[PDB]
Amino acid sequence: EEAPFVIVESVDPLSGTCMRNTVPCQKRIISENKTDEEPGYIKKCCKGFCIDILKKISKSVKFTYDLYLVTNGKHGKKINGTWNGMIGEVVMKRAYMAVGSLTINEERSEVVDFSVPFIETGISVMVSRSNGTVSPSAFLEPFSACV
């Protein structure tokens, strides 16, 4: 949904349908289950970083694809000892691959398999820069003891 690698953007008919470096994507939204109508909905076009790596994998390994956003059984995790999520929806063959925000731990990799990673990530820190470094021993620093 909302990584900084795959951004969703709703369409404007400027060209009748999302174009110009994007690829279409779908997500069947519905509620009020008693409606008993045809269930599903429409969705938008998907671009970004992982979208970009996707296109270059595609037109160089020669397949055709189609994206569908995930709605329920949220982003991969553990529940009741079963496997919902962005791994379950690859173990239940409702899809075939998952691209985007994942990791390689010892649990999300017993069910599905993994590629060779294309960034690095891990637990890091974040600090400030320490504005100001007046050297307190300057007033005898310039001239060496030779003079």
Binding site: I104, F114, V116, P117, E120, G122
Partner: protein, 101 residues
Amino acid sequence: ICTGPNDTSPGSPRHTVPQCCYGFCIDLLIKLARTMQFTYEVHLVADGKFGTQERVQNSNKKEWNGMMGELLSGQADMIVAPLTINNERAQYIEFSKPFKY
């Protein structure tokens, strides 16, 4: 212990003498070995270089150099060293996941 004819670099013949090979990677090899029941005896590179592909035999064939050449030939059996990940070696050998990013 760690074997090797490495008493001399390329440019002079080799005399077979064991040595010591300690440091960082041996601890990872062992932390895995107890995890998968190894019993090893580590070898060293006879080419003194990593190894890649080039035109050999004054002809139009190929032959992988260095330690990867020692490996694919079958003499070796596993690569622990800071070995890089690049497409040109990916096609003939099986990498693990990366460990030291």
